[PDB]
């Protein structure tokens, strides 16, 4: 697209300010890829492999981590 624009895989041009900013806008997901790690957030739970999930998903009874660490008893002791 334009030099000040980023081209998604669907042929739609967005701005570079929308590249790696947390929200996905390129339909398929061409944005929010590569760049640097987002290192989760202060209000987000960190899975053992490095995946970031919302903190309300920690020990809710259902697995949400890829490795299933969110339901492990090591972090929440029943």
């Amino acid at each position: 697209c334009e030099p000040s624009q980023f081209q998604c895989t669907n042929g739609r041009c967005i701005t570079l300010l929308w590249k790696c900013d947390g929200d996905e806008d390129c339909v398929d997901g061409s944005d929010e890829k590569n760049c640097v790690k987002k290192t989760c957030a202060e209000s987000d739970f960190v899975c053992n492999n490095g995946q970031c999930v919302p903190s309300r998903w920690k020990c809710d009874g259902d697995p949400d981590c890829e490795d299933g660490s969110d339901e492990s008893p090591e972090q929440c002791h029943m």
Binding site: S4, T15, L16, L17
Partner: protein
Amino acid sequence: IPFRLTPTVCPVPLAHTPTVTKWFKGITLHLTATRPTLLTTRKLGLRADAT
């Protein structure tokens, strides 16, 4: 020397679109602007009376 000057994209204000009153060999712009705004006019001919 850290903190390299890099080219990014920034938003810049868009002024109010001027109403044009149209007379026989001229235009009159009304040009409301709260802040200083650059108006540049040129003639599309041999002598560009650039104001």
